[PDB]
Design a protein around this ligand. Sequence first.
Ligand SMILES: O=C[C@H](O)[C@H](O)[C@H](O)COP(=O)(O)O
Ligand SMILES: C[As](C)(=O)[O-]
Ligand SMILES: C[As](C)(=O)[O-]
Ligand SMILES: C[As](C)(=O)[O-]
Ligand SMILES: C[As](C)(=O)[O-]
Lengths: 248, 248, 246, 247, 246
Amino acid sequence: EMQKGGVIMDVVNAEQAKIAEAAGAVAVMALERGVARMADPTVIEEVMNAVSIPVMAKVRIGHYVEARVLEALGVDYIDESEVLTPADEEFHIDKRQFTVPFVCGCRDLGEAARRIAEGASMLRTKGEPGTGNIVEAVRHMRKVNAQIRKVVNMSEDELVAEAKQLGAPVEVLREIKRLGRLPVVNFAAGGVTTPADAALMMHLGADGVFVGSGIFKSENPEKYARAIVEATTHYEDYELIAHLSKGL
Amino acid sequence: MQKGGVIMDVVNAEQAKIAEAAGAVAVMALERVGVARMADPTVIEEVMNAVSIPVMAXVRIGHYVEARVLEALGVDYIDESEVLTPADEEFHIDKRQFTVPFVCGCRDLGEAARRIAEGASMLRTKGEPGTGNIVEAVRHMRKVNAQIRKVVNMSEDELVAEAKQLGAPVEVLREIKRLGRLPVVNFAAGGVTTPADAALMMHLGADGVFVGSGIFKSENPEKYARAIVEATTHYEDYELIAHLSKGL
Amino acid sequence: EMQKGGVIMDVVNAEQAKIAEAAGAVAVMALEGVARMADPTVIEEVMNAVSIPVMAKVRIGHYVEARVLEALGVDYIDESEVLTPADEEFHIDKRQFTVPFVCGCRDLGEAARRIAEGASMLRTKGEPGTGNIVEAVRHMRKVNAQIRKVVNMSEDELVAEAKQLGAPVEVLREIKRLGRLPVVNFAAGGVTTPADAALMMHLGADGVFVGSGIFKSENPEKYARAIVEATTHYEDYELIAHLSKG
Amino acid sequence: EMQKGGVIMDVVNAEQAKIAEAAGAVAVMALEGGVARMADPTVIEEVMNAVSIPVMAKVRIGHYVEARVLEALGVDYIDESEVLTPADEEFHIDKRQFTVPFVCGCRDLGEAARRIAEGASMLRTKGEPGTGNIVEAVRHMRKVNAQIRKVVNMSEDELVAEAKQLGAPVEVLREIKRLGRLPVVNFAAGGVTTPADAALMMHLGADGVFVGSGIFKSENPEKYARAIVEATTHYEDYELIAHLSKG
Amino acid sequence: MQKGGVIMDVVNAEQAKIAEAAGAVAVMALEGVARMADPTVIEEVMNAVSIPVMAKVRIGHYVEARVLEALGVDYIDESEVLTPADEEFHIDKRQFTVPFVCGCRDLGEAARRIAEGASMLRTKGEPGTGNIVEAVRHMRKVNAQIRKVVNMSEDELVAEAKQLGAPVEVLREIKRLGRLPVVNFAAGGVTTPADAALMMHLGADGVFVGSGIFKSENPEKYARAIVEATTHYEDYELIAHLSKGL
Ligand SMILES: O=C[C@H](O)[C@H](O)[C@H](O)COP(=O)(O)O
Ligand SMILES: C[As](C)(=O)[O-]
Ligand SMILES: C[As](C)(=O)[O-]
Ligand SMILES: C[As](C)(=O)[O-]
Ligand SMILES: C[As](C)(=O)[O-]
């Protein structure tokens, strides 16, 4: 349901949210930005009222009540996020018990499958945040997709052992083999900075990309956001991507 | 399914009839106890023709074709057995593809759950074979059942992490929590020698016991087999068990 | 290429060779401390006894043993790890020969190196003489799992995959293109029962090698026959069950 | 690049590019801690319009799309460069899929052969960058060329094992043995600072040299660039090199 | 000795004559601790043939060597198969009239033996195994190291010498000649005609063969086959024919 090919953008207020929507973002991620927690509900409501596209926000890993709060606020997606300060080092939220869908992070297929078994409706394949360095996203998108291709083509009777080795639930691997891909959407995130970066993640088999606040620190945010959106959609149109790269 | 019962190893029709007469719920046809393989089909047919109770026979771990052969012979259960020389060190038979039910070995809940995910219809909790030493059976029945009790009572949102730690498929753990026990029958095996041994395994939560060829090396096999059968059925009748122990 | 589905049998003389041929073997392997190439006399005896292809073994790296067998008119040379290796580091440059070679392998890296040296056929095999099929199974599972990975992997990842496997990338590229090895790959190592032979086919072997154990049985021709039929009809479990009785 | 004996120069603008061309460079490399990426296309176009010699630019290792962008801009060579921040730690670009030729870095023959198997059209043998220390270039040119000489003269039947040990594709080694050298041009790079440095790399068997922005931080860039060009071309003319070193 | 030749171990005059008759280019006279042979046995062999006679001495045993020199032996073999007399220092062979053959396992050893005054080399691993791998490993190593030196940049030789433990002047000489400045024969497990021809294929100048020859049913035929195989080492039809008897 999350528009494959799409871009999700971090926004801290209504103004930024409108710009993101206008640029063609498929959704926005409402943020406030020591200990980093769920954002003030006021800020989230401000963003929810400002746009018609889906609004995400987010919670600390394992913070069941932060998630219930966001659910009660009417948020469209909850992001159980590793960039916030984890509330639980061992157990993620049991997302199956919620009405609102969750996006979760993953670095390999084992993690992806465990997040899915917990009830994740969407994945974000991501390494380290805030670096501006795409290598984080690339490493993990390459890993996850390589592991998927292996599972898709492997002998059926080898899956249980593969699941053991990956730390994955076998039924998720069986579903992956059946579909030829993950049963949920998987967006890239981590250092996606240029239009070429965004298109690269699509080339590597991402379903879409997350982009951070860097967009709004540029001289012309609406042009920059726009370039990312178009590059992500038209990820094989290298003449366009070249042209879009000139402004920055 | 066949709870409270005793399954006996037999090498011929004579032994098989004795086992049936003693009250065994099934027999396990063997050639002997170098490389140990599936038994000659002739020996298995001899045992099948000699009795009306279910007949089991052993295949090497991972030996898909040995299993198909036994299936074609009309065997009632296939035992994918660790006492035979493994054919595959990494991958067990995909038992879901078979008509005939399988029994598999396990030493802990992770193994049990993996065998179930491969399609096992019954479990045999067992350590080392041929020792006459019950400690093998006890160690593993205690481990499996302790791990089950933990899962049954644990917080629902901790299961995915528990599954990862055990190397188990989470859907099997979820099923275990739902039923309050394993979704298949779990018999003890390994060194069950005396009537007290058999009753002990039932005390520890086994659904039944396997016993080996030791029975037929005694002076009075039919009496000995009988004593095991009665002790396993009446596992809390200590006066009876005491009386049954006097002979041999 | 060899009749995929086939059985290749070890024979020490003309009598055994004829039995193997009669049982339906696709080829025979002529055989005779340090284990060397067999006396040419024994190989010629086997060559004259049958019309099916005749193979014979040389020590790993023993270029001249191979040239000798080539001169004798052998149909295939088996550069064999069960003989005492003559060279621990370098296999024969089989590209320089007219006669085709079969080589052993335990994983895809080895397979690809043997192919780059000019191997025309592979034998996926672990330890010999054990009667234990686990040797064959371990390596056939490994080689085929690695092939499936290569066939489906992203094209731009192959150079790195080759580095990691110790394989020549052009062989991996060829594998990806064909969806399989560019040569026939038979299982060997402890193939003892008809069920064993059929199992190897189930695991994706193109055929099987079987050793002298056949001729130590009470009825070699019946035994050889059972292996041949099981290998050909590897999914006919009723037949395999029947064949296992004797 | 095509012309062996040549010098390739880093330039950040049209002015520098013209100077490089005037000094006799065979090509220019257009350039713009923190993250180092492909340069703004505007800067690359500025350099392309300023000169008639080939223009190189760039991309991060593994950054397939940055490379496609430069291809679309009409760049003459793409440099998949280790001095930029790698985008992919494991997989380099599949350069066979491109129209424009690539130069890649290498530190030994195994790397060189892997880059060639990925479709590299040119090599840059280089250690650490930005030091002004020629030891980086020397170590690796000595290693690569020593390994080549070994392969060229070694017994044919030992190449498969040699390839395994190097981590090289055997067909590239076979090609090397057949030609008596690498099938692509191999330039030195890394700390080439003086005319003597440039001539040394040629003495050690380089096909040419890359030089960095240091040239344009000198008092007389055109004279300095010129001295490097002449020293690289006339690498055994020690009287000339001595004279060129005075300024 | 003469290139392409075979040197044979003999324990008496009878064996020595057979070796000479078979076409050996020289013979090696032989007789817990293994020492120089009784001079009587060596004289018996010297009187029995016209081809050169060698014998082997213990390593470092300067006086054993002087004794053999005084007996009129044609070559002294400072041999690792005898019990070493000196673990650290080989004989200073430059002080002798009679030429020495020495063993080596790699180019460093070869070059050190040459610097001590060796006139001939024997590239050899372990003795008495019947396993050619010993000879092959070391002939491949020595010749690979030579090819490297022959083609390497002149200014890199001093460092190469340091790394090999070799005298640089010997490496310089090797580079100049394109080969070792002395003859280098293979030894160690050379058993069949194919073995002998293989060593020549690998770049040996000749081969040593042990007493195994005289434990065969027909020593003169066997010795003969080795001689012809070593001389005609690329004539595979001949080598194949020569292998039949044995
Ligand atoms: O930075 C977020 C990481 O993925 C965490 O270490 C996460 O808690 C690990 O996932 P799992 O608990 O499934 O290993
Ligand atoms: C450790 As297992 C092969 O029994 O799942
Ligand atoms: C090429 As190999 C059998 O030495 O790994
Ligand atoms: C294949 As590489 C030189 O990045 O190790
Ligand atoms: C055999 As030595 C003493 O030269 O190392």
